Design a protein around this ligand. Structure first.
Ligand SMILES: Cc1nc2[nH]c(N)nc(=S)c2[nH]1
Ligand code: NI
Length: 316
């Protein structure tokens, strides 16, 4: 009934935010392992849900164009001012990525080379709940599969928003919905495997042990180290997952997730080995050590630099 807008099709309905290609490349940010809720339905047109609404996003060399689908039986209008603010905060556009790129570059030549080809990789400020349960799905997984699991989980447990072409859009579930006695069984049906148990258990744990989603808000203002430790008490959440959530949803720019990719990057590209470890390969200690290494080199926005390299290590 209703269709995925392009900018050519329905230019009336779009609005714009002044934003150079160099501060944000949508195609590098939206499907490079931060959010799993965005897809390029038509070329250069990214559609996804954001806080119980659907958006299509596209950009020129100096403009970010965006349009909103309210969902309900609505008078299709342009994005409001508040909705444009919501998108501004989402891309943390107050932060100048140009100055961060040069600041990291001045101590790190490897970064300088990569950053040539990979500009406009910045961090989304994601909802905590959505980031938590998406990253619980990330264990022993690739982006594409995580994307699939998260989509079905939202269709199965989350409120229906709107349909566009053959795609139905659902909001992220509340904790209560994931915590119930049939939730693990349903989630296995949806292909999550062992992650089904961690999803239900962490949903149940945040409700009963931590008092629901205001807890995640507390962790947003809590210092990084405290947030990381508290996340790590949850079923299915270790250092990597906890660091991804810290970086991506709890405003801890210094959080450096250490997975197989950044372990490999460190060794291959930086010649780093664990010093204070005698054991040669990965471990909790060595991984924590590697995180410290990157903070020391890049500074309090080490997490963001790390995202530039992670994103670049996907594209051959
Ligand atoms: C899905 C995903 N896994 C990740 N691991 C690391 N180290 N960095 C990022 S940004 C990431 N994203
Ligand atoms: Ni070596």
């Amino acid at each position: 009934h209703m269709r995925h807008r392009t900018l050519s099709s329905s230019p009336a309905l779009w609005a714009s935010i002044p934003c150079p290609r160099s501060e944000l490349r949508l195609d590098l940010v939206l499907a490079s392992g931060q959010s799993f809720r965005w897809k390029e339905q038509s070329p250069a047109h990214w559609s996804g849900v954001l806080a119980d609404q659907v958006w299509t996003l596209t950009q020129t060399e100096d403009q970010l164009y965006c349009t909103v689908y309210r969902g309900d039986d609505s008078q299709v209008s342009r994005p409001t001012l508040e909705e444009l603010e919501t998108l501004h905060k989402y891309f943390q556009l107050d932060v100048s990525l140009a100055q961060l790129y040069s600041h990291w570059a001045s101590v790190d030549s490897h970064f300088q080379r990569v950053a040539q080809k990979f500009q406009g990789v910045r961090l989304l400020r994601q909802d905590p709940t959505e980031c938590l349960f998406s990253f619980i799905c990330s264990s022993n997984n690739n982006i594409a599969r995580i994307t699939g699991m998260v989509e079905r989980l939202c269709q199965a447990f989350g409120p229906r928003l709107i349909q566009l072409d053959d795609v139905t859009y659902h909001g992220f579930p509340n904790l209560h919905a994931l915590a119930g006695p049939e939730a693990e069984t349903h989630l296995r049906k949806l292909g999550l495997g062992y992650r089904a148990r961690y999803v239900r258990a962490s949903a149940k744990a945040i409700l009963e042990e931590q008092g629901g989603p205001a807890w995640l808000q507390q962790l947003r203002v809590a210092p990084y180290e405290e947030a990381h430790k508290a996340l790590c008490t949850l079923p299915g959440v270790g250092a990597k997952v906890a660091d991804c959530i810290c970086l991506m949803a709890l405003d801890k720019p210094q959080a450096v997730p250490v997975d197989v990719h950044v372990w490999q990057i460190a060794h291959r590209d930086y010649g780093w080995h664990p010093k204070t470890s005698q054991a040669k390969g990965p471990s909790p200690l060595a991984n924590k050590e590697l995180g410290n290494f990157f903070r020391n080199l890049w500074g309090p926005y080490a997490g963001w630099a790390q995202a530039v390299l992670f994103s670049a290590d996907l594209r051959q």
